[PDB]
Amino acid sequence: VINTFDGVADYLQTYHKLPDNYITKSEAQALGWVASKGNLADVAPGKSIGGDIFSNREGKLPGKSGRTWREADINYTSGFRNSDRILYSSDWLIYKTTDAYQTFTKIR
Numbered sequence: 001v002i003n004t005f006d007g008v009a010d011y012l013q014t015y016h017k018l019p020d021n022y023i024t025k026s027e028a029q030a031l032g033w034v035a036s037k038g039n040l041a042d043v044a045p046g047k048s049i050g051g052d053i054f055s056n057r058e059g060k061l062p063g064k065s066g067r068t069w070r071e072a073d074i075n076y077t078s079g080f081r082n083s084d085r086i087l088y089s090s091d092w093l094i095y096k097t098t099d100a101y102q103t104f105t106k107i108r
Helices: 005-015 025-031
Strands: 069-073 085-089 094-097
Touching: 005 085, 005 094
Parallel strands: none
Antiparallel strands: 069 085, 085 094
C-alpha cells in the first residue's frame, strides 16, 4: 500500500519485496485494465500498476555484466496514472522520472 518514489525505493532497499499494492502490466491488463477505460479504482480502489520485467538491453538505465530493470507507477489514488514513475534494478538501484518515462533522475 505505497506509491511514493523514496517510499517504494526504501521498501525495496529494505524489504526487497514489491510494495504490497503493485501488479505487473500483464496482470493489470489481463485483470481487465483497458486503455479506453482506465478501470482501476473499481476493481482496485487504491492500487498502482508496476512490477514488470525488463533487461534494459536498450541501455536506457544503469547496466553492468547482465542487469535487470523493472518499473512501478507512482503518485496514484483512484482513476488513471500520470507522469510520476519510479525505476528499480536488480541491485536495487532506484531512479525517478516524472515526465512519463522521459528524464530518469537518480534517487537511490
